[PDB]
Amino acid sequence: EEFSMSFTPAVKEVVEFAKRIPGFRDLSQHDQVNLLKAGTFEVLMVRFASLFDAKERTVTFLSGKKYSGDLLNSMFEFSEKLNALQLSDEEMSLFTAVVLVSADRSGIENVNSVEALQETLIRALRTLIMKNHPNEASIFTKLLLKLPDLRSLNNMHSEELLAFK
């Protein structure tokens, strides 16, 4: 409850976010549906982190209200680690687009076009991180390391979410 349904309109939000990713609407319709089908779960993981605060033990839901079981524990270790980097909203958005365009390539027909879009987003992320965190370049590396982590959480818990919310 009070979090079940909270992730239904969130799916609608990912679709709209993707549409705003420069170049996304150039990929085949086939590839756009597949990136969203495969990556929506990983983007939602990042969005959750963004609505968490281990610095105050508060978890805010896209729904509004604020509060403080083994996926939920993973979502906390994940969120704490990511929240540690102290990214700005702009970095957070760019990173989320990288996550979406980094999704499982199994159902993708034009991988070259998807890798080309990921490259463009990756280069901007690194460029944007170096500028806002000149002495913390490593922040960029830590973010890439999270891609394999999110793919595992996905492989393991997507079903217990991508089902009736």
Side-chain angles (χ1 to χ4, degrees), residues 1-163:
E1 332 143 316
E2 305 191 303
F3 184 68
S4 179
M5 294 179 88
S6 73
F7 268 51
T8 297
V11 168
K12 173 174 273 60
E13 191 165 294
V14 175
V15 183
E16 305 305 330
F17 175 71
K19 293 186 190 306
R20 283 134 48 185
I21 296 175
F24 191 78
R25 279 175 294 113
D26 293 329
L27 308 167
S28 63
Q29 251 189 176
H30 181 71
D31 296 346
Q32 293 180 56
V33 167
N34 265 68
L35 292 176
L36 290 164
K37 283 181 156 59
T40 288
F41 174 94
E42 289 168 46
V43 159
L44 285 170
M45 292 296 86
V46 184
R47 183 187 302 180
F48 177 89
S50 297
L51 305 176
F52 172 54
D53 188 355
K55 301 183 285 186
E56 283 176 49
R57 179 158 297 305
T58 174
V59 188
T60 294
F61 300 0
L62 192 287
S63 354
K65 296 196 291 177
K66 26 189 180 175
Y67 312 68
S68 69
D70 304 303
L71 155 61
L72 193 153
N73 198 280
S74 287
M75 285 174 84
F76 275 133
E77 287 172 58
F78 184 78
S79 296
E80 277 181 55
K81 293 172 184 173
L82 178 57
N83 287 14
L85 279 23
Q86 311 188 300
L87 303 166
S88 60
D89 299 337
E90 198 190 331
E91 313 183 295
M92 197 60 82
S93 283
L94 233 193
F95 174 58
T96 296
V98 165
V99 167
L100 174 53
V101 185
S102 287
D104 192 328
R105 279 92 173 76
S106 280
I108 301 291
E109 64 191 20
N110 191 331
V111 167
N112 295 276
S113 70
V114 169
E115 299 185 323
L117 176 52
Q118 176 188 212
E119 179 166 82
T120 302
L121 290 165
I122 285 299
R123 293 191 312 271
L125 183 67
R126 166 159 164 46
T127 280
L128 187 285
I129 291 291
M130 309 285 268
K131 175 169 64 180
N132 303 159
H133 310 257
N135 297 123
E136 279 91 58
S138 65
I139 288 190
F140 174 70
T141 282
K142 313 289 273 302
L143 287 170
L144 295 164
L145 292 186
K146 287 175 169 46
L147 299 181
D149 289 5
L150 291 159
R151 191 57 49 68
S152 280
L153 292 173
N154 203 338
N155 185 202
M156 186 123 315
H157 307 290
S158 78
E159 267 185 290
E160 54 183 287
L161 202 87
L162 296 171

